[PDB]
Amino acid sequence: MEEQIVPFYGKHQAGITTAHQTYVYFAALDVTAKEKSDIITLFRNWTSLTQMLTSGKKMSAEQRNQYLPPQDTGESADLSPSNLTVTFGFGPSFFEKDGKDRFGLKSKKPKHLAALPAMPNDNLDEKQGGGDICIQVCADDEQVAFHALRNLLNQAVGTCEVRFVNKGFLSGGKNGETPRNLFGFKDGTGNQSTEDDSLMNSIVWVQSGEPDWMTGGTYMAFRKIKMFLEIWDRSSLKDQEDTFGRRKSSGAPFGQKKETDPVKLNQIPSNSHVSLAKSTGKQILRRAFSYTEGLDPKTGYMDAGLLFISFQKNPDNQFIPMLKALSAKDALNEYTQTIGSALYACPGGCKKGEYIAQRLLES
Amino acid sequence: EEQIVPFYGKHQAGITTAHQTYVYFAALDVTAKEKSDIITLFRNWTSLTQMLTSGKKMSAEQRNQYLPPQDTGESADLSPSNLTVTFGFGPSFFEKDGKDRFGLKSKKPKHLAALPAMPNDNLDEKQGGGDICIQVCADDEQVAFHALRNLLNQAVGTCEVRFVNKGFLSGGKNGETPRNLFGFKDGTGNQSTEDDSLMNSIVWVQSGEPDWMTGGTYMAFRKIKMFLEIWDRSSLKDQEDTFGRRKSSGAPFGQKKETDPVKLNQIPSNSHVSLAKSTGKQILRRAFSYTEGLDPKTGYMDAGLLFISFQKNPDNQFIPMLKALSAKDALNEYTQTIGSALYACPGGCKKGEYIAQRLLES
Numbered sequence: 001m002e003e004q005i006v007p008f009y010g011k012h013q014a015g016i017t018t019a020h021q022t023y024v025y026f027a028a029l030d031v032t033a034k035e036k037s038d039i040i041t042l043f044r045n046w047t048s049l050t051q052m053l054t055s056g057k058k059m060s061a062e063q064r065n066q067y068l069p070p071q072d073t074g075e076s077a078d079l080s081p082s083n084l085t086v087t088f089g090f091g092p093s094f095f096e097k098d099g100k101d102r103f104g105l106k107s108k109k110p111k112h113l114a115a116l117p118a119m120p121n122d123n124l125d126e127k128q129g130g131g132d133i134c135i136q137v138c139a140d141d142e143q144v145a146f147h148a149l150r151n152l153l154n155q156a157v158g159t160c161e162v163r164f165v166n167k168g169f170l171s172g173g174k175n176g177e178t179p180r181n182l183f184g185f186k187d188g189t190g191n192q193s194t195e196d197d198s199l200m201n202s203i204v205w206v207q208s209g210e211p212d213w214m215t216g217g218t219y220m221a222f223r224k225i226k227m228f229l230e231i232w233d234r235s236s237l238k239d240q241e242d243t244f245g246r247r248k249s250s251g252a253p254f255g256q257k258k259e260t261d262p263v264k265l266n267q268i269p270s271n272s273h274v275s276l277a278k279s280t281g282k283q284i285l286r287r288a289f290s291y292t293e294g295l296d297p298k299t300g301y302m303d304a305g306l307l308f309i310s311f312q313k314n315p316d317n318q319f320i321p322m323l324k325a326l327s328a329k330d331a332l333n334e335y336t337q338t339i340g341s342a343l344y345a346c347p348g349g350c351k352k353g354e355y356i357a358q359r360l361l362e363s
Numbered sequence: 364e365e366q367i368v369p370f371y372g373k374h375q376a377g378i379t380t381a382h383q384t385y386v387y388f389a390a391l392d393v394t395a396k397e398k399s400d401i402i403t404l405f406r407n408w409t410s411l412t413q414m415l416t417s418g419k420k421m422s423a424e425q426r427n428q429y430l431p432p433q434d435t436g437e438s439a440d441l442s443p444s445n446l447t448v449t450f451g452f453g454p455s456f457f458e459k460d461g462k463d464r465f466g467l468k469s470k471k472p473k474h475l476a477a478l479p480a481m482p483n484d485n486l487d488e489k490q491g492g493g494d495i496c497i498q499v500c501a502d503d504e505q506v507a508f509h510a511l512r513n514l515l516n517q518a519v520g521t522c523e524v525r526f527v528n529k530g531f532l533s534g535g536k537n538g539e540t541p542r543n544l545f546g547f548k549d550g551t552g553n554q555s556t557e558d559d560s561l562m563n564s565i566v567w568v569q570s571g572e573p574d575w576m577t578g579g580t581y582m583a584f585r586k587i588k589m590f591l592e593i594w595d596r597s598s599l600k601d602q603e604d605t606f607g608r609r610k611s612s613g614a615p616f617g618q619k620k621e622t623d624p625v626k627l628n629q630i631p632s633n634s635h636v637s638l639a640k641s642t643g644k645q646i647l648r649r650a651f652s653y654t655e656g657l658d659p660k661t662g663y664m665d666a667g668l669l670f671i672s673f674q675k676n677p678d679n680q681f682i683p684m685l686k687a688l689s690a691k692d693a694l695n696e697y698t699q700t701i702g703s704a705l706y707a708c709p710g711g712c713k714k715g716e717y718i719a720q721r722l723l724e725s
């Protein structure tokens with residue numbers, strides 16, 4: 001190809017319809033500062049630095065003063081940009097924490113930004129969820145990704161405490177096949193094409209009915225979903241395919257030849273994952289990554305799962321009904337448990353000369 | 364190229380092999396009572412490893428829908444990505460709590476013992492040791508994890524998993540020395556892994572050891588937390604002084620290039636490089652950075668180095684360096700060892716033999 005540089009500036013924030021990279025670092029933060037003007041400072045600086053990290057500009061580093069810290073941590077000096085994207089979102093608690101509109105922003109609050117409803121089978125750790133700000137960092141190289149997060153978080157010392165940092169991977173096939181999750185199934189097929197503007201306009205991107213700063217933005221849902229690999233791996237192929245209602249290998253819906261053939265609902269169990277998701281009639285854009293965090297001390301097996309991230313213009317319409325219908329009855333519940341949860345509103349894109357969330361934080 | 368690294372040969376791969384980007388590193392404790400069980404394990408591990416590393420896909424559509432799939436499937440569409448798997452054995456494999464469980468004492472390597480305690484250690488016992496270690500490397504995380512997962516699946520009933528760590532280390536886009544999380548080039552001081560004579564002198568067992576160890580080596584493992592927040596707010600002067608090399612160039616102080624010989628008289632004597640180089644000893648370092656979320660005990664990134672090095676004789680090459688460093692290293696300010704192990708790596712496997720056969724007996 002050419003180079004791996006994804007624009008930072010644009011109508012939309014990168015990292016959403018951007019072709020899905022291999023690695024993610026996913027972080028949520030709380031603001032401890034009390035003035036809005038501290039926040040403007042954080043967003044201005046986050047903006048300058050994201051532009052620089054994603055563009056491929058390297059900091060010269062001829063430090064005028066040996067006695068100060070280097071402005072960059074340096075572990076990416078010799079690395080390509082690797083399609084780095086950084087996407088920012090704001091949780092409900094940014095607009096109103098514990099009854100208080102801390103920053104005078106409750107009137108610019110997005111139409112559908114609220115914590116997700118409790119669902120059956122949830123086993124949420126509150127500290128593994130929520131947050132005032134999320135940063136989603138993606139790249140084709142784990143070290144490029146970590147470097148961007150670390151340097152971004154360094155800038156937030158004084159203003160924000162870091163709540164959690166997750167990270168994940170998902171490898172696409174050598175010839176561009178749909179990437180497989182840890183259950184060994186193709187994961188993404190049902191997404192519409194990220195290159196179809198019409199469909200992305202109708203499924204993902206905010207155009208009306210929200211505060212101006214959300215124009216060209218979207219909502220991001222996050223669910224941290226542990227996957228029980230040892231249970232799954234001991235299951236028959238029949239149980240695996242029936243759980244989803246596609247064939248493992250081909251990815252095709254039952255009774256069909258190809259991955260991309262329409263789902264025949266009447267040929268798949270009612271409570272198969274695909275049946276339940278498709279049957280709400282609604283669409284989202286899933287952009288998830290697998291994770292592993294070593295051994296689970298409470299299990300003695302691998303701690304592994306899915307960092308479920310989806311984008312949608314109206315989560316009340318598009319997402320929560322899906323969540324409701326799967327949480328009750330999904331065959332997949334046999335093999336998974338949700339342990340983290342958040343919904344964030346992601347601002348529209350940054351224009352050159354403005355900063356992220358400006359039309360929110362100003363005037 | 365084709366991205367295939369031979370599994371069979373004089374040595375195990377993953378030691379002098381070019382450093383891949385990703386690692387998964389596991390240790391297991393044998394729970395089986397009979398050597399014959401361990402023999403089964405090693406046989407399976409062998410044939411499975413050869414498949415995984417070779418580029419061979421299962422690619423034979425399952426008969427009997429009612430059985431578990433033999434492979435977990437998530438590497439079906441991936442390149443083998445230079446995958447290597449390296450096995451080793453800890454002391455407790457040969458003798459646990461003064462009992463020779465599998466009748467192997469008399470085949471025990473000359474230099475295999477738990478590493479001595481050192482100042483500034485804060486070892487978690489459950490984050491080192493183990494009877495067996497598996498080091499899995501590849502240029503793609505998903506490939507490496509798949510390999511580990513399917514190896515470990517085979518071990519169910521024979522072993523319990525002690526711990527699984529994983530990490531990364533990206534080489535420069537033009538083949539520059541990879542940088543660690545402190546942002547310094549990491550590996551300049553190793554000899555060329557392409558020089559058989561040097562590797563023979565430093566890494567590979569040729570004599571003085573049981574036969575199964577011929578072509579093998581010893582693997583030292585040190586899990587070292589790196590306090591990135593402490594380091595990032597340090598001055599550049601302090602960071603360079605910690606090592607005795609310039610961050611950017613990687614040059615020894617007062618020299619022009621990375622490859623230039625260190626001048627000991629030009630670097631601080633408590634500097635990392637001065638202390639290491641001054642034992643006059645040599646090792647082959649093949650380490651990986653790790654990140655493991657927020658450390659709850661500090662609210663900062665939990666991050667570090669999976670220090671891994673290879674040496675024909677640890678008592679001569681490695682234990683000294685450790686001694687030399689542990690009390691005076693400037694790095695002590697920014698790091699803390701929290702896990703430790705030493706393991707003996709069998710010589711390579713021949714086509715038709717299994718790993719550690721000569722130790723186990725066939």
Ligand code: HEM
Pocket residue numbers: 181183185186187188189190191223225226227244246263273274277278284286305306308319322323326332336
């Ligand atoms: C560990 C958790 C999960 C796994 C392993 C998983 C896996 C899968 C797989 C294998 C498919 C079929 C291929 C595809 O179209 O991607 C699929 C489809 C889908 N999943 Fe999931 N999923 C998980 C959680 C969720 C959650 C929480 C949601 C929504 C709330 C969700 C929504 C969907 C949707 C909308 C589809 C597409 C249905 C259609 O064809 O229209 N998934 N998922």
Ligand code: HEM
Pocket residue numbers: 543545547548549550551552553585587588589606608625635636639640645646648667668670681684685688694698
């Ligand atoms: C977090 C822990 C560590 C870090 C970040 C680290 C980093 C470095 C760096 C930046 C260098 C100089 C460039 C190079 O030659 O690679 C170096 C050299 C070296 N380190 Fe370390 N190191 C660590 C732990 C250790 C330990 C535990 C040992 C052995 C006990 C060790 C042994 C050496 C040796 C032998 C050299 C080469 C000295 C020579 O030039 O001959 N390192 N290390």
Ligand SMILES: COc1ccc(CO)cc1OC
Pocket residue numbers: 381382534540541549550551553556647648649650651
């Ligand atoms: C890529 O060269 C290396 C760089 C770093 C290490 C770990 O210190 C090992 C290397 O090759 C054996």
Ligand SMILES: [Cl-]
Pocket residue numbers: 269270271272
């Ligand atoms: Cl059903």
Ligand SMILES: [Cl-]
Pocket residue numbers: 543544545589651652653667668
């Ligand atoms: Cl590191």
